[PDB]
Amino acid sequence: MSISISYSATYGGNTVAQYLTDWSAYFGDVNHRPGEVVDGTNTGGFNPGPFDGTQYAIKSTASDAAFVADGNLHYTLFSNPSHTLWGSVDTISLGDTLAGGSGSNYNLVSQEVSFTNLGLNSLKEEGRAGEVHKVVYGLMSGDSSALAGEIDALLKAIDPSLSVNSTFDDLAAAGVAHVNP
């Protein structure tokens, strides 16, 4: 299935690339790094978890920004290859004001953009070189490059004219993106 994008009308005139840069600047970096994960404040969480589920979500420690990844996800924690997120991601949703987690599915109250039918898939054995790992860990760490590259490849696979340098409105014109009510 080809990529499909939903977006808040607010961002219609933004390029996908520019939106991702800005969102990442707003989320910042949760400092999910050696020596810097010392409590539960920058781990994020799995649904149902603790180390697997159909969602991973994390809140910014710098702002209200948050994201949710939907799919079939597994985190190795200390087990070799350590600190690898692997499995499949179908959807990534970016925005503000995370809700749920506790019997409810994670969801953003302000879902700004959502990218679905991503068909990302990574095996455990790929370790931290897996596309799933790099995409999500990038977002955690203030670098939306990996996500941008993946969306870019999925748009181009539809047609070489479509890319992250298109606006959301451009992609809606091309039938690939859709404004949220």
- Residues making up the binding site for heme: 32, 75
Is residue 56 a contact partner of residue 88, using CB atoms and an 8 Å limit?
Answer: no
Say if strands 45-48 and 52-59 run parallel, antiparallel, or are unpaired.
antiparallel
What torsion, rounded to 10 degrees, do the Cα atoms 162, 168, 172, 173 define?
-70
Q: Is 158 helix (H, G, I), strand (E, B) or coil?
A: helix
Q: Kindly state whether residue 89 participates in binding ligand HEM, applying the rule CB under 6 A.
A: no
Q: Is the CB of 7 or the CB of 106 nearer to ligand HEM?
A: 106
Q: Kindly state whether residue 136 participates in binding ligand HEM, applying the rule CB under 6 A.
A: yes
Q: Kindly state whether residue 160 participates in binding ligand HEM, applying the rule CB under 6 A.
A: no
Given 32, 54, 90, 99, the residue binding ligand HEM (CB under 6 A): 32
Residues 115-134 that bind ligand HEM (CB under 6 A): 128, 133
Q: Kindly state whether residue 103 participates in binding ligand HEM, applying the rule CB under 6 A.
A: no
Q: Which of 67, 21, 74, 24 is nearest to 46 (CA)?
A: 74
Structure token pair of residue 33: 């790094």
Given 8, 62, 64, 83, the residue binding ligand HEM (CB under 6 A): 83
Q: What whole-number distance in Å separates Cα of residue 167 and Cα of residue 106?
A: 27
Q: Is the CB of 26 or the CB of 137 nearer to ligand HEM?
A: 137
Which residues of the chain form contacts with ligand HEM (CB under 6 A)?
Answer: 32-35, 37, 43-46, 56, 75, 77, 83, 85, 128, 133, 136-137, 140
